[PDB]
Write a protein that holds these residues in place. Sequence first.
Motif, PDB file in Angstrom:
ATOM      1  N   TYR A  57       3.210 -51.962 -94.744  1.00  0.00           N
ATOM      2  CA  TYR A  57       2.058 -52.064 -93.821  1.00  0.00           C
ATOM      3  C   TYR A  57       0.784 -52.203 -94.616  1.00  0.00           C
ATOM      4  N   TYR A  61       2.428 -54.833 -89.417  1.00  0.00           N
ATOM      5  CA  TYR A  61       2.900 -53.659 -88.645  1.00  0.00           C
ATOM      6  C   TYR A  61       4.017 -54.046 -87.703  1.00  0.00           C
ATOM      7  N   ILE A  62       3.995 -55.312 -87.296  1.00  0.00           N
ATOM      8  CA  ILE A  62       4.889 -55.849 -86.290  1.00  0.00           C
ATOM      9  C   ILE A  62       6.122 -56.531 -86.881  1.00  0.00           C
TER      10      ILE A  62
HETATM   11 NA    NA Z   1       7.138 -52.302 -88.144  1.00  0.00          NA
END
Ligand code: NA
Lengths: 253, 29
Positions: free
Chosen positions: A128, B27-28
Amino acid sequence: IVEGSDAEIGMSPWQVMLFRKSPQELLCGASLISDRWVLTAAHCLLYPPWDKNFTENDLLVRIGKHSNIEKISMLEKIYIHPRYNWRENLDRDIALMKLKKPVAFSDYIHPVCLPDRETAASLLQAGYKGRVTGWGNLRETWTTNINEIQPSVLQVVNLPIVERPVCKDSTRIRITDNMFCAGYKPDEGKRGDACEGDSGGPFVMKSPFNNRWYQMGIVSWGEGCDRDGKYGFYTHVFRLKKWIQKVIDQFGE
Amino acid sequence: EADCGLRPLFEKKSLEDKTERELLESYID
Ligand code: NA
Ligand SMILES: *[C@@H]1O[C@H](CO)[C@@H](O)[C@H](O)[C@H]1NC(C)=O
Ligand code: NA
């Protein structure tokens, strides 16, 4: 910031610069978290191995700077985490600075959010990406002149959070839970890092839940800048938030 | 929270900055 780009106008309105008051000197990055409180790295203010031990009266902050847009503020007081470990590994590398008086917000001056438990849990995952901003050096070393590595505009770079075993494997320094590391791996192609002068500045992430920017990290330490197989280390803001809240609750009436 | 984390020149005007999508995509994915 190494391998970043010029920030867009108003992209990072919580950005703060920490200066020695007189004579003038840029010391560190910082971030605005309310009209009166600025968050930074403890080592920016207290670091005996470089004979560093600043008081409120030694310092000024600048806010709203991109390149009458920009605000100069004095500090009332500095608060360093009581368990900040400068002797060993910079554990708990965090400090608060209370402005002499509150600042007015504008298009260029606006506070970043501090994470809550849920946001931190969701977003603090390997791969992330967060975003680091600063007025630090453009590269570790210069080739032609001293000023070819100093930027004229605020710099921005997006960097992925790295797996803890890879972070720990990359350094001899004992890393704690109060640190995370971020940056690209050699094999990923892309590059980027914080560098000299970026310390204390924010690592932010944008919430998919409410579309607010949250400060998850504080630029803490690294080994050189943008080196293959090395990563930047950042203070884990959420893990230390009870301390942040304790300081604001005690000294913020 | 007040208005923390909402930028006057971006979120408040329904404008995206040039690289924020890269953050959200990570994040996706
Ligand atoms: Na994710
Ligand atoms: C500066 O000196 C020490 C160095 O460790 C520091 O901890 C402290 O905040 C400052 N001194 C005093 C007397 O407060
Ligand atoms: Na690296």
